């Protein structure tokens, strides 16, 4: 009946209100109760916004009383905007400026629901030339802030906005439009923010939302994929120089606060760390800042961030990176507590993976001198991790992280296709063999079982063989005869096969992988 009722309203417009036998506000108010349910179909919204607002009865109260609720049920269509731009014709009838204010507020509030916003954008100048009149500027500014595309930023419009700014005030709406025009082709330069006033309409417009429901590059994850894919010269250098001068200036920022600046630097180094974990190669300013700031470094100043930066260090030689960095990750490793000690063999644990990834595809993209680098890194950690074992009187926490490093040394051949089976230095092997807990004992057992698996796999494809097999049979005969204190703890808590089952069943999985082997 609304289509019939709205054509009756049009008849109420083809004739005067006085000549009508019934009131408009009665029938239009029945339509208003309908709007409280569903205000205007796309065709209905079109027509009732067209004829009620061009010239006809459309009282600046009545046309507004509808215009407060003359929005759309499904979506507003182009033909709605078409001849209401002929209500924007703004002439003998003009739908005088108050109803113009509610009309441009209509468009601002329902800019989100148009099928083809490009059509209205193609109508950009028709509303841009409506910016000159004073009453619609606070609302037309919002509308063009919502309508603006690069094709609509012709320099004459830039000069018109500048003329409007000079003639009129510094009004924040003009500033917002100027911000967009600066975001596009910068023929103008300037340095509130979509704070809307349709909130009163957003009773009805929130109903409309519910009705539709029912009826330089680090902080850009979508752009980080580009730099991930371009190993180009002027972009990895445009980016290196920013990282070096951000990790210098904002780290000199420590020397003046060291407490409150120690939270944005931590949260910026976290973004660097995440960008490297995604992009997967160490930023060439990440190491260059590390060699510069490792000797000066303390134990706990951004430890969680600095020792994740070490992980992403472009594999260099372990003869040019050892003296520069690893001679300081031993200068602090041997002087700091366990809680920094475990944070280095973990840091170098992740460094080992981030070097072995880049070596796996060095096999994929077609060695020996690269081989000697990871082998020497592991031995130097294996040198690091026998004397850290001695500093802390065989602390089980530290050796747990040591094995966590070595949990990624057993599986070099199986995981990374690298023939680099490096066995335990005995200062860890027997120190965990004759250790006193099983969460470290089964850890060692898992590592050596993966060592058996990796050595057997290396025997298939092929110094390692002679001395490495000798050392692993040493670690075998000594230990397989030894396979005991934490097992004694279990036995006290506790028929050999049943003892096994009591084991095995109770989480001893590294022991399972050995015993099955």
């Amino acid at each position: 009946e609304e289509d019939a009722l709205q054509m009756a309203v049009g008849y109420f417009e083809k004739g005067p209100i006085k000549a009508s036998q019934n009131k408009d506000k009665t029938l239009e108010k029945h339509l208003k109760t309908v709007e409280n349910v569903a205000w205007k179909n796309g065709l209905a919204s079109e027509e009732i916004d067209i004829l009620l607002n061009i010239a006809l009865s459309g009282k600046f109260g009545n046309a507004v009383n509808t215009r407060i609720l003359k929005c759309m049920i499904p979506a507003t269509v182009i033909s709605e905007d078409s001849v209401v731009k002929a209500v924007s014709w703004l002439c003998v009838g003009k739908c005088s400026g108050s109803t113009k204010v509610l009309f441009y507020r209509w468009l601002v509030a329902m800019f989100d629901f148009i099928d083809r916003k490009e059509q209205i954008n193609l109508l950009y100048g028709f509303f841009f030339a409506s910016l000159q009149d004073d009453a619609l500027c606070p609302y037309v500014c919002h509308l063009l802030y919502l309508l603006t595309k690069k094709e609509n930023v012709k320099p004459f419009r830039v000069r018109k906005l500048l003329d409007l700014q000079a003639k009129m005030g510094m009004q924040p709406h003009l500033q917002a439009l100027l911000s967009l025009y600066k975001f596009f082709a910068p023929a103008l330069i300037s340095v509130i923010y979509f704070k809307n006033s349709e909130n009163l309409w957003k009773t009805a417009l929130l109903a409309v939302k519910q009705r539709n429901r029912g009826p330089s590059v680090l902080n850009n994850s979508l752009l980080l994929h580009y730099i991930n894919c371009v190993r180009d010269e002027p972009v990895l250098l445009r980016f290196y120089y920013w990282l070096s001068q951000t990790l210098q200036e904002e780290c000199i920022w420590y020397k003046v606060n060291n407490y409150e600046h120690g939270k944005e630097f931590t949260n910026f180094l976290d973004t660097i760390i995440r960008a490297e974990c995604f992009l997967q190669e160490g930023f060439y300013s990440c190491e260059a800042f590390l060699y510069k700031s490792l000797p000066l470094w303390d134990g706990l100043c951004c430890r969680s961030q600095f020792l994740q930066l070490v992980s992403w260090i472009p594999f260099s030689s372990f003869s040019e990176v050892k003296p520069l960095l690893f001679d300081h990750l031993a200068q602090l490793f041997f002087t700091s507590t366990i809680y920094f000690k475990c944070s280095v063999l973990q840091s170098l644990k992740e460094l080992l993976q981030n070097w072995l990834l880049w070596l796996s595809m060095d096999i994929h993209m077609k060695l020996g001198g690269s081989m000697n680098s990871v082998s020497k890194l592991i031995h130097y950690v294996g040198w690091l991790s026998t004397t850290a074992m001695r500093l802390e009187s065989n602390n089980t926490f530290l050796l747990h992280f040591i094995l966590d490093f070595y949990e990624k040394v057993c599986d070099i051949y199986i995981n990374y296709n690298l023939p680099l089976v490096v066995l335990f230095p005995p200062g860890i092997f027997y120190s965990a063999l004759l250790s006193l807990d099983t969460s470290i004992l089964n850890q060692l057992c898992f590592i050596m079982h993966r060592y058996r698996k990796n050595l057997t796999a290396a025997k298939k494809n092929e110094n390692f063989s002679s001395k490495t097999y000798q050392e692993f049979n040493h670690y075998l005969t000594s230990m397989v005869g030894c396979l005991h204190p934490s097992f004694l703890s279990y036995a006290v808590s506790f028929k050999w096969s049943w003892y096994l089952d009591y084991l095995f069943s109770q989480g001893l999985q590294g022991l399972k992988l050995f015993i099955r082997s």
Partner: peptide
């Protein structure tokens, strides 16, 4: 991480 965690057992 276990580095951000290892910085809060140093304190705690």
């Amino acid at each position: 991480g276990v580095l951000a965690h290892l910085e809060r057992l140093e304190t705690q």
